[PDB]
Design a protein around this ligand. Structure first.
Ligand code: WJO
Ligand code: NAG
Length: 765
């Protein structure tokens, strides 16, 4: 019944619009398979289309906004695109129809409406691009009856091992088709839907824009060669209409031109299922999925006061659909340095110059191929899996579909190498590499990242203790199933735990350092003079200079998080020998956190280093780092230290802004310095941890109950309203928020952990 729930899950989630890197496209969860993609662009001139065409997501003044209004990866959803440059408000409805043996069917409607600014007679080129990889697979455009292209629907017939037989139909659609009176129409038609079937080597099929353009260019070249010139040129839109040449191949370009508003449908029908999908099916299934989304939201994301209002409901729906709608399937090679150069051991003073020398050797090679099913921080900027990010992405996702969240966890944990390492950044394939500068591509086996994924596991454990509907919760409703999942994953958790202790170990025994345990001390590998990327807080101030004797209180607290999870799960599995080891370790971290990181002078936790005279010095920078033992739920509710941190959290002269907790205190000397990335701005993921922990303390007998309750109340209010106001004004979730103005800044479309705001509003932790 485990293999059984897993098969149903496979079959449920197989198809989706799993390529978040482009405005609209589909692929299944198979590395080499069938993929689709949308492109559109107005054409006003002979040279304009190349600049107007849209394919991959970006964010600039050209594009007012875009994102999912509703989305469930099991059912589908609706996306809105507001394109200023192209004068177009576009809608992409995508829906899945279960049935057959090949992971169901699906269908999409593309609607375009000219906005009030656009010339009512705008010409907009639309393209649907279809590709197939695999050695023993086939795809054919059925030719049209008419000479120059299609009056009606385009039908592609295809077969593959993974998909069996299928047909994919691009319908004729509603909208005016411009007609050309030029001579050229004697050879190219007056204007009509056209199909070009091509073949390239598989590994380049992803490069839709160049492949399209190569075809467009050959078309213009043809015109020049056949004496169609400036003496009397065809209309631009006719110049960019491809000559119709359907056939078979691994690429199929379907192209339409519309004047004014337009719409058309894609109907993918698995032959494995019953009758083929129809447009009338698309309409029904879309309507029904909306109703299902509606019900589920109100049940799973019941917004509590003061956010019960519809305005906040719309807000929550937008933040949630954009987070979950970013889910993607990625496939390909990673770039990894597998040298394990000794300089990465970072055992010297000046180690950053050593590690740069080993990097300068360029031993990194491609390896894999790998696959990952994951949500993502940002469609336009960061369309790929980030390890500690996903920790936050999955917390609301888990509420919505726990079976979904566990798939994504499973997916992430399957990338782990024999040592226990998962690269913090998953760049899989040439496609995924295209949106990443060479400098950032290479992964390093010594670089960790917060194990925020254990948080989600924690929530599942607590839920496990206490057909699309059924599937979504099968892993808590069937305890046998839950446990079996944990049994299989547990080895990997423990592996990773040990990997932290082998690779991220701090140096006690070699200095003047007394403390309750000889074992417990952690230091992030990977740090440079001004950064510690691996920690998540890229430019939070750390001991200067960086130094092999550093200890990092955030890292130690993360290890804390892991052991608490390991206790819970080991118990559930009865790994008794294990659960005793964990208990001794937890005990030691609790003590060592105090002995090695607590500053009575300053009233908070601190990183450590070793002095010029080789003695242990605390280095205190009051901000997120300083709160870590508390954010990670390690502190006893009656602790004087907890209470001292509540003073810090609440104190407006340090971290308490009207808009949330500042990453760094106004008092610190690094406040608003350098890039000011984690050096003042409000970050929603770290605020979320605080809000959750405050609520913990508030809902328990203890000396800090009523202080916590008040901070909770205000922080929840502050964070939500800041994100909401910004959403209202700008349409976007932002990466961080400005503590002085409340303005969102850095990156847009960050959903992304900002979306955590949905869970914050719904409350009752
Ligand atoms: O959310 C992810 C991550 C969190 O894990 C961290 O905690 C947080 O501190 C930072 N974030 C975000 C993050 C920030 C920087 C990088 C690398 N720089 C980089 C520079 C330019 C591009 N471009 C892509 C398209 O446009 C032109 C070029 C892309 C990347 C990666 C992620
Ligand atoms: C889905 O099923 C196929 C065939 O049974 C299998 O190759 C694949 O591993 C499954 N996908 C995963 C692991 O998500």
């Amino acid at each position: 019944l485990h293999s059984e729930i897993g098969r149903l899950n496979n079959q449920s989630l197989l198809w989706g619009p799993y390529r978040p890197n482009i405005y609209f496209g589909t692929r299944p969860r198979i590395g080499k398979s069938l993929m689709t993609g949308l492109m559109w662009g107005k054409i006003e001139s002979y040279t304009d289309f190349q600049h107007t065409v849209r394919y991959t997501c970006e964010q600039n003044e050209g594009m007012k906004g875009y994102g999912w209004d509703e989305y469930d990866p099991r059912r589908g959803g609706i996306q809105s695109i507001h394109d200023i440059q192209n004068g177009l408000d576009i809608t992409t409805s995508f829906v899945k129809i279960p049935g057959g043996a090949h992971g169901g069917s699906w269908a999409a409607r593309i609607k375009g409406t000219l906005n009030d600014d656009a010339p009512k007679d705008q010409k907009t080129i639309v393209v649907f691009y279809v590709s197939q990889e695999g050695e023993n697979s086939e795809l054919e455009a059925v030719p049209s009856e008419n000479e120059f292209g299609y009056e009606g629907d385009v039908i592609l017939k295809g077969r593959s091992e993974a998909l069996g037989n299928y047909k994919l139909v691009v319908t004729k659609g509603k909208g005016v088709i411009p007609q050309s009176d030029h001579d050229l129409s004697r050879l190219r038609g007056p204007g009509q839907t056209v199909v070009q079937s091509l073949t390239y080597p598989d590994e380049v099929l992803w490069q839709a824009k160049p492949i399209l353009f190569q075809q467009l260019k050959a078309g213009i070249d043809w015109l020049v060669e056949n004496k169609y010139d400036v003496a009397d040129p065809p209309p631009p839109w006719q110049v960019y209409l491809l000559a119709n040449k359907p056939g078979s191949g691994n690429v199929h370009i379907v192209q339409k031109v519309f004047e004014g508003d337009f719409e058309f449908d894609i109907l993918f029908s698995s032959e494995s299922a019953g009758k083929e999908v129809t447009s009338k099916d698309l309409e029904r299934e879309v309507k029904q999925a909306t109703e299902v989304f509606g019900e589920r939201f109100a049940r799973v994301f019941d917004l509590k006061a003061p956010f019960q209002g519809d305005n906040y409901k719309k807000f929550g729906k937008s933040m949630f659909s954009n987070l979950i709608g970013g889910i993607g399937y990625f496939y390909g090679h990673s770039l990894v340095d597998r040298s394990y150069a000794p300089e990465y051991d970072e055992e010297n003073e000046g180690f950053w110059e050593d590690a740069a020398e080993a990097r300068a050797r360029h031993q990194e090679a491609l390896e894999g191929p790998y696959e990952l099913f994951t949500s993502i921080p940002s469609r336009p900027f960061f369309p790929r899996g980030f390890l500690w990010d996903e920790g936050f992405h999955l917390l609301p996702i888990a509420d919505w579909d726990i079976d979904l969240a566990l798939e994504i966890i499973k997916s992430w944990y399957n990338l782990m190498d024999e040592d226990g390492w998962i690269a913090r950044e998953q760049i899989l394939g040439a496609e995924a590499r295209s949106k990443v500068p060479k400098e950032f591509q290479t992964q390093y086996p010594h670089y960790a990242n917060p194990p925020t994924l254990f948080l989600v596991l924690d929530n599942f454990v607590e839920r496990l203790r206490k057909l699309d509907e059924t599937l979504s919760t099968a892993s808590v409703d069937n305890p046998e199933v839950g446990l079996e999942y944990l049994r299989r994953l547990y080895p990997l958790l423990r592996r990773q735990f040990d990997w932290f202790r082998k690779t991220q170990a701090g140096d006690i025994k070699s200095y003047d350092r007394e403390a309750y345990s000889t074992k417990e001390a952690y230091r992030w590998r990977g740090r440079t003079v001004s950064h510690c990327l691996t920690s998540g807080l890229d430019d939070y101030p750390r001991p200067q200079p960086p130094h092999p004797g550093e200890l990092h209180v955030d890292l130690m607290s993360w290890v804390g998080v892991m052991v608490k999870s390991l206790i819970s799960i080991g118990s559930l599995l009865g790994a008794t020998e294990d659960v005793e080891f964990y208990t001794k370790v937890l005990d030691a971290i609790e003590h060592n956190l105090d002995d090695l990181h607590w500053s009575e002078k300053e009233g908070c936790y601190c990183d450590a280093t070793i002095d010029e005279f080789e003695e242990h010095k605390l280095v205190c920078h009051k901000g997120y780092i300083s709160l870590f033992p508390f954010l990670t739920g390690l502190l006893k509710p009656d602790s004087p230290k907890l209470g001292k941190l509540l003073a810090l959290i609440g104190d407006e002269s340090e971290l308490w802004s009207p808009y949330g907790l500042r990453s760094l205190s106004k008092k610190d000397e690094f406040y608003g310095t350098a890039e000011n990335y984690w050096r003042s701005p409000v970050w929603i993921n770290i605020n979320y941890l605080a809000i959750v922990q405050l609520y913990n303390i508030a809902t328990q007998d203890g000396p800090y109950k009523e202080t916590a309750r008040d901070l909770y109340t205000r922080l929840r209010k502050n964070i939500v309203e800041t994100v909401y106001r910004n959403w209202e004004e700008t349409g976007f979730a932002w990466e961080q928020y400005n503590p002085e103005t409340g303005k969102g800044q850095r990156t847009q479309h960050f959903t992304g952990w900002t979306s955590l705001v949905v869970k914050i509003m719904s409350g009752h932790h």
